[PDB]
Nucleic acid binder design. Structure first.
Ligand SMILES: Nc1ncnc2c1ncn2[C@@H]1O[C@H](CSCC[C@H](N)C(=O)O)[C@@H](O)[C@H]1O
Ligand SMILES: OC[C@@]1(O)OC[C@@H](O)[C@@H](O)[C@@H]1O
Ligand SMILES: OC[C@H]1O[C@H](O)[C@H](O)[C@@H](O)[C@@H]1O
Ligand SMILES: OC[C@H]1O[C@H](O)[C@H](O)[C@@H](O)[C@@H]1O
Ligand SMILES: OC[C@H]1O[C@H](O)[C@H](O)[C@@H](O)[C@@H]1O
Ligand SMILES: OC[C@H]1O[C@H](O)[C@H](O)[C@@H](O)[C@@H]1O
Ligand SMILES: [Cl-]
Ligand SMILES: [Cl-]
Ligand SMILES: [Mn+2]
Ligand SMILES: [Zn+2]
Lengths: 109, 300
RNA sequence: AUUA
């Protein structure tokens, strides 16, 4: 047995559930590389940068990581149009290993 | 928000106010409680820590490779650590950042210790100590505003035992959350001030900043008199709320200076060493592994 | 003290 936190949150949102609040949005230049996960805020003009730990479902829910946490101690760049649910965006999307940006938001791998 | 100080990250207590001998009075800010207009979706503590860091960027902070920073009172009622996220953004990549709080929270720090700060131990010295601790019971004002103990007793001992010479501190105080011994320790640094963030100018909150620890008294400070001087300054100098400095983050990151780190015995700290410490050009401490722990009281 |  294993509690599937990811699917449970996707189902919660689908039923009109309110997105996880208190994701820490950082002040930045908005002239960054635009990469998905970085050591420092890298939001471009079309993104918002958030503290990684606050955007991790496993960190926020106090649950085991499915593996090490790749967001804790880093900054996640979220398209401004999706910045209302950073936890949901990090779960429903994947990062282009080569490029470093989100698949369907600057790259395709 | 039209005075020239509105474009600064905040306001430091002017030197003439530090040299007075005022009696302690009730703090009465003309804009008490007013809220600042922050950039869309930005939390109060991201704005506050951003302004504290922008101000620290103007001081002679020592910034060695493998810098060691500890952040007390890093948790929040939100269950996250906005201040730690800003420190992580500000500090050079590779800086060891440890944070702590009485209550559980999720952090971007390299290590997090949960428990009363009095349970935190380290056989290592630190280059920068940040405290945002505040005792909720401080709100229950039932008597004379006297020097407070609790976590302030721990912070004074932590600075005297675990702060590297050349190191700096930023310790949050308020009208009622303050300690006389902490103000006295400010006289053990090359320079000190009480800094008010422009986003929280409507609060008696200030960060007591000690810049470049000398491990010996450079000036004798009476803590009761200095807190009275601080309140007098706040009561007679209204600060307009301002978020202006939050919009220009181009020069925000703390510059890595590669400040020299040396181990020296108290008998080797001559005036030449004190001069280097006083200019942020030297850190004196061991460069051993960083080991931390939280004491656990066992009950049946 | 953890703005609004
Ligand atoms: N004795 C003590 N030991 C440890 N933490 C303490 C303490 N007394 C108060 N605190 C903590 O001080 C904090 C004040 S609120 C801190 C907010 C945080 N700096 C931020 O970035 O938003 C609370 O989390 C409280 O638990
Ligand atoms: O978590 C997303 C968010 O927009 O939710 C509402 C507030 O808590 C914001 O600070 C936070 O970034
Ligand atoms: O950015 C510099 C700012 O500070 C200056 O002292 C002026 O008061 C202000 O007009 C200016 O915009
Ligand atoms: O002489 C004191 C000066 O140096 C100190 O180190 C401070 O960093 C600076 O703000 C101050 O003006
Ligand atoms: O760690 C944060 C918690 O402790 C603080 O002292 C606050 O009083 C409380 O509101 C908060 O939930
Ligand atoms: O809300 C009062 C003031 O504070 C804000 O932080 C802004 O700097 C200013 O535009 C506003 O008028
Ligand atoms: Cl007390
Ligand atoms: Cl700097
Ligand atoms: Mn306030
Ligand atoms: Zn995580």
């Amino acid at each position: 047995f294993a509690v599937d936190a990811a699917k449970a949150y996707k189902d919660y949102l689908a039923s009109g559930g309110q997105p996880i609040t208190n994701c820490v949005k950082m002040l930045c230049t908005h002239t960054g590389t635009g990469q998905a996960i970085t050591v420092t805020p890298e939001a471009n003009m079309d993104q918002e940068s958030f503290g990684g730990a606050s955007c991790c479902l496993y960190c926020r829910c106090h649950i085991d990581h499915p593996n090490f946490c790749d967001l804790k101690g880093k900054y996640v760049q979220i398209p401004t149009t999706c910045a209302n649910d950073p936890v949901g965006f990090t779960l429903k999307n994947t990062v282009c290993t080569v490029c470093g940006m989100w698949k369907g938001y600057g790259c395709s791998c | 928000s039209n005075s020239s100080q509105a474009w600064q990250p905040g306001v430091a207590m002017p030197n003439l106010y530090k040299m007075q001998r005022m009696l302690l009075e009730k703090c009465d800010l003309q804009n008490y409680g007013d809220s600042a207009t922050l950039p869309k979706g930005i939390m109060m503590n991201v704005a506050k820590y951003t302004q504290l860091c922008q101000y620290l960027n103007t001081l002679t902070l020592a910034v060695p490779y493998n810098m060691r920073v500890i952040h007390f009172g890093a948790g929040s009622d939100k269950g996250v650590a906005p201040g730690t996220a800003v420190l992580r953004q500000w500090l050079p990549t590779g800086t060891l950042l440890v944070d702590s709080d009485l209550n559980d929270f999720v952090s971007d720090a390299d290590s997090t210790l949960i428990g009363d700060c009095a349970t935190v131990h380290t056989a290592n010295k630190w280059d920068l100590i940040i405290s945002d601790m505040y005792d909720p019971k401080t709100k229950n004002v039932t008597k004379e505003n006297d020097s407070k103990e609790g976590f302030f007793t721990y912070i004074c001992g932590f600075i005297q035992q675990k702060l590297a010479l050349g190191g700096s501190v930023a310790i949050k105080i308020t009208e009622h959350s303050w300690n006389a011994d902490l103000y006295k320790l400010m006289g053990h640094f090359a320079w000190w001030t009480a800094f008010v963030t422009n986003v929280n100018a409507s609060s008696s909150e200030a960060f007591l900043i000690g810049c470049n620890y000398l491990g010996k008294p450079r000036e004798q400070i009476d803590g009761y008199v200095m807190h009275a001087n601080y309140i007098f300054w706040r009561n007679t100098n209204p600060i307009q709320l301002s978020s202006y400095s939050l919009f220009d983050m181009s020069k925000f990151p703390l510059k890595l200076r590669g400040t020299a780190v040396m181990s020296l015995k108290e008998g080797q700290i001559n005036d030449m060493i004190l001069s280097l410490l006083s200019k942020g050009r030297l850190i004196i401490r061991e460069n051993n592994r960083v080991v931390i722990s939280s004491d656990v009281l066992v009950n049946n």
